[PDB]
C-alpha cells in the first residue's frame, strides 16, 4: 500500500511510530526579509524533527534544494542554512551531491545558476540490516553503481521540483526493496511514485488537496499496477 | 610594494585601514578533528574564521568580495563529514555579507548506502553590500578578458583544474573579481599562491600568514614566480 496523507507535514509525521521510515527524500515547498527567511527555515526544522524521529537508525533524510536567488543581487544559502540546522537535531552530515541541473567579458559579471544541492543528512544508531533477498534484489549493476554514487550528476537536466528519473536514482541508492520512502512535500508525487516503481513503499504528506489528487491521477499513470491512497486526514465518515 | 605580513591574522587585518582592500582569495587554514566535544572545537573553529571575516568585511571596499576556497572535512572511522563552507556562508551572512553563487571547484558489494568520495571544494562569494569602485577606462581595457576565457571562467562547475588551490584557480579569480592595480588581500598566504597570482596580473599583493617560515617559503616561490618582482615580508 502507497499512502500520502494530505495536511500539515510536522502534526501528520508526528502522528507516525519512530523508527518506522527507512529514506526521506524530499524538496522543501520553497514556492510557499530574513524574518521570512527565517521563519521559513524554523518551520522546515519542525518537520526535519520528526523526520529524525520517524527514521530508523542509519536511515537518511535527503533533501534536494536549489540556492535561491531572489538594491542589488544576491543569493539565500538555503542548502547551507539547512545542513547547519540539520546538524543542532542531531543528523550526522554527509557530502551532498551536485545536481548539475542546467549544463562585456570584463570582472565582476555574475554566474548563472546551473546547480541544485542533494544535501545527505544520516540519523546515527548503527547500520542497516537487510534480509538476504533485499540485498540480492537492490544490488546495484557495476554500471549503475558507478554512475550513481559520485559527486555530481550532470546526465538528468532540469525539467515537480525534480524529475522521477533523478529521485528513482536516489531511492534504488538510500534503501532496498520493501522499504518505506517518504516525502514530507509530495506535491504532484514525484518521489512516491519513483518509490513505487522501484518496489519500495510509498509514504508521503502533501498541504494542497488539489496536488494530492494531481499525484493520484499521476501515480496510476505512472506506476503500473498500483495505485496512491490519498488520505484527507480525518477520514471518518 | 606587494606584501607578506607575519602575524595573527584577526591582529594584523585588525591594523589596516577600512575599504582598503578590493578582493579576498583564500583558503581556511587546515584544521583536523583531533561525545559532541568533536562539534565543540569545529564550532570553536568557525568562531575563529568569523574573527577574520569580519576583518575582511571592513577592510573590503563596498562591491569588493571574499573568495572562500573550501573543501569539507570528512572523517570515517563512523563516516562523518563537517559541512565546512555551509558554516561559512551562514556565519557570513551574520556578518553583513551578500551572498553570492559559489563556484564548485571539481578537483578529483554494489550495495545501497555506499559512501561517496568526495571530489570537490567550495568556491565561496560573498560580497560587501554599499555600492562599489568605478573602474578606470584603463584598468577596464586591460582587466578585459579574452571572449573564450570569460566563458571559461564564469560558470558554476570547474573542471579543467585539477597546496591548497593551484595557482591557475587563484589566477582566474584574481582576473574574474578585480582589476590591474586592485588590492588583492589572502589572510592566509601559506606559500603565496595568491599573491603571486595578483602580482602576475598587475594587481597589488597583500597577505598575512601565522609562520614565519612559511612566510620565507613564499617570497622565495614569488621571486622566482614572479621575475624582476620581490615579495616584502615583514613581522608585524
Redesign the interface.
Known amino acids: 500500500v502507497h499512502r500520502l496523507h494530505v495536511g500539515d507535514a510536522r502534526e501528520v509525521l508526528a502522528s507516525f511510530p519512530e523508527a518506522s521510515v527507512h529514506l526521506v527524500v524530499t524538496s522543501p515547498p520553497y514556492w510557499t526579509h ?1 524574518e521570512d527567511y527565517e521563519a521559513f527555515l524554523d518551520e522546515l526544522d519542525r518537520v526535519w524533527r520528526e523526520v529524525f524521529r520517524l527514521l530508523v537508525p ?1 536511515g537518511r533524510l535527503v533533501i534536494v534544494v536549489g ?1 535561491v ?1 531572489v ?7 538555503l ?3 539547512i ?2 540546522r540539520c ?1 543542532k537535531l542531531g543528523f ?4 551532498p ?2 545536481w ?1 541541473k542546467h549544463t562585456p ?11 541544485e544541492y542533494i544535501l545527505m543528512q544520516r540519523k ?1 544508531g548503527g ?2 540490516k537487510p534480509t538476504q533477498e533485499q ?1 540480492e534484489k ?5 554500471e549503475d ?1 558507478h554512475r550513481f ?4 550528476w550532470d546526465d538528468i537536466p532540469g525539467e515537480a521540483p525534480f524529475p522521477l528519473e533523478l529521485a528513482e536514482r536516489l531511492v ?5 526493496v520493501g522499504d518505506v520512502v517518504l516525502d514530507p512535500f509530495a506535491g504532484t508525487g514525484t518521489t512516491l511514485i519513483a518509490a513505487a516503481r522501484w518496489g519500495r513503499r510509498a509514504l508521503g504528506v502533501e498541504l494542497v488537496p488539489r496536488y494530492a489528487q494531481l499525484a493520484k491521477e499521476r501515480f496510476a499513470r505512472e506506476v503500473p499496477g498500483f495505485s496512491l491512497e490519498v488520505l484527507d486526514g480525518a477520514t471518518h465518515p
Open positions: 530574513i542509519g540556492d536567488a538594491g542589488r543581487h544576491l543569493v539565500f544559502p542548502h547551507a542554512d545542513q547547519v546538524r550526522d552530515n554527509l557530502n551531491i551536485i548539475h567579458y570584463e570582472p565582476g559579471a555574475i554566474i548563472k545558476t546551473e546547480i546515527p547500520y542497516r540485498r537492490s544490488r546495484l549493476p557495476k553503481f554514487f559520485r559527486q555530481i534504488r541508492m538510500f534503501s532496498f
